[PDB]
Symmetry: C3
Subunit: 209 residues, 3 copies
């Protein structure tokens, strides 16, 4: 129906598969610590799965009026990111044994980041979308700024790299400037999401930290 | 007005009453541990009270189009369950001193469970409602799978038993197949809710664990 | 456009400024404890900033039908208060080293307080708005009831005093009786909000507790 359906069906399948893989691997885990990393890392694609599926079916899609057009906005991504991004930071934070003080900074900057992104997404005055983008981007840079040694270091690098593309994709995509069509937009986010969650989780869960 | 009002007024009264009872009983509690069980167990009907009331008044009711009809859906139940179900699992988890790792699995599976139930409830393609039902049901079975010795054992049994009816009621009720009318549906959930919260709480709070 | 814009622009600027001040001051903080108070206290105006801005721009404003009129309701305040009020109680609670049991009572009573306030705000039957007001007010009195020695004592007093005006303002404002216009209403909340967050935070962060 919608040309981007194939990328949504595919992300659904890969988050679906990735969840099951992590579930099965986390069986045989007595370790308090590993228990924690496993619950976190399996929850991330499990949530992604549900929101890829809601997008695949018409549910996590709405039409937002701006620039003289009704524009198709996938709101379900923010509902995913709202929980999946703090869990990933929490994976990193527990890894290096961050202070409560620092987790709350990361987690709270993270909610502001995707909170303001959602507002950007649904804002009906074109110009103001970019104000909300700018604010969310500044909350992202705070997180990067704030962001065993070896796998943390690797995981942080992957994070810094993949997370940074998201505002770039949103900015040039249908949420922002409309220069890259929803189609390739949805592919781009698909590859990003699977790498930041299943990829990130493979790295983390097969590692000894 | 609506034939099911009497069951909503009644659940409101019983959650209202149950909250006050637990409040009054929790006075004279110096114990850190008991403090924790009391705050949890009193919060559960206090939230239920507000959502029984929002349903009683027209607020937590919307009309969802599917199957060629506009169908009356009580969305306020999910807003209740979203917080009340993790608190009940938390009562059980603290009881047996579960790992952080395991609480996060329970709590996160619980949010997916009622998260997907809400989507099921509001989904406008009849067939897809049942996909969302199936996913939520599978998250429920995970929780049951994951789920002093004596009161835990009793409390777990009550939980396993009453929680399992909910998807059955939803499936045959107005959310699903429309074979049991909203009326008796609302009665059924009423009895279930009061038993899983006030009943569960009586058992737990009068016990010595 | 809207006469109350000047108070929204102003609250935006002061929450904006207050956030930056606290950020800059929290640099050079190695202390686990102070780390915690700083993350909490900086998050509070950072969130307020975003919701003052959403209100300034048309976003956090909706029209609710009651009393034969469509009434302008600023829903974005509840989205602010939902997170900012538990963080402030958490500042107080950590200050005096409250039990987990007591934090959960405070935090959960706090969510019910602003939860029911939101319902009040959007309720389309005039009379019922005041039922929801009454319930939220009773959850507030519970919190006050439940609510180093010196700065706690000072901070508690400020809290008791400023928080208590909010239901008074809502009751006489456009949410309730419509006796005080939105204009002065927005000014009143503006002064209250800046005092309860930036004022409260100055007191707390310059203090040695
Ligand atoms: C699994 C999903 C991941 C790791 C997604 C991360 C998303 C972000 C870092 C999003 C950032 C955004 C901005 C900085 C502004 C524009 C809107 C967003 C939400 C795309
Ligand atoms: C106090 C309320 C309780 C304990 C409610 C528990 C509710 C559930 C276990 C609901 C489960 C559902 C499914 C498994 C799928 C269909 C939708 C739900 C949300 C009714
Ligand atoms: C920074 C913001 C603060 C401290 C706001 C606090 C708000 C309240 C204590 C609000 C209380 C309300 C009622 C008790 C009933 C009417 C609705 C509210 C939400 C204004
Ligand atoms: C949106 C993620 C924050 C939820 C935390 C409430 C304690
Ligand atoms: C919906 C229950 C989860 C809220 C947790 C955020 C930390
Ligand atoms: C609304 C504040 C509560 C979020 C807590 C979920 C654990």
């Amino acid at each position: 129906g919608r040309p981007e359906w194939i990328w949504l069906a595919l992300g659904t399948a890969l988050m679906g598969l990735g969840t099951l893989y992590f579930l099965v691997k986390g069986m045989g885990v007595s370790d308090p610590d590993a228990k924690k990393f496993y619950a976190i890392t399996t929850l991330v694609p499990a949530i992604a799965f549900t929101m890829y599926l809601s997008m695949l079916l018409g549910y996590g899609l709405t039409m937002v009026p701006f620039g003289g057009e009704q524009n198709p906005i996938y709101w379900a991504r923010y509902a995913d990111w709202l929980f999946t991004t703090p869990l990933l930071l929490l994976d990193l934070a527990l890894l290096v044994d961050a202070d409560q003080g620092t987790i709350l900074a990361l987690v709270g900057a993270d909610g502001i980041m995707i909170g303001t992104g959602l507002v950007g997404a649904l804002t009906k005055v074109y110009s103001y979308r970019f104000v909300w983008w700018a604010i969310s981007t500044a909350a992202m840079l705070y997180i990067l700024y704030v962001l065993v040694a070896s796998t943390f270091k690797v995981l942080r690098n992957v994070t810094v790299v993949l997370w940074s593309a998201y505002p770039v994709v949103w900015l040039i995509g249908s949420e922002g400037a409309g220069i890259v069509p929803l189609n390739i937009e949805t592919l781009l986010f698909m590859v990003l999401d699977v790498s930041a969650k299943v990829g990130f989780g493979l790295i983390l869960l097969r590692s000894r930290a």
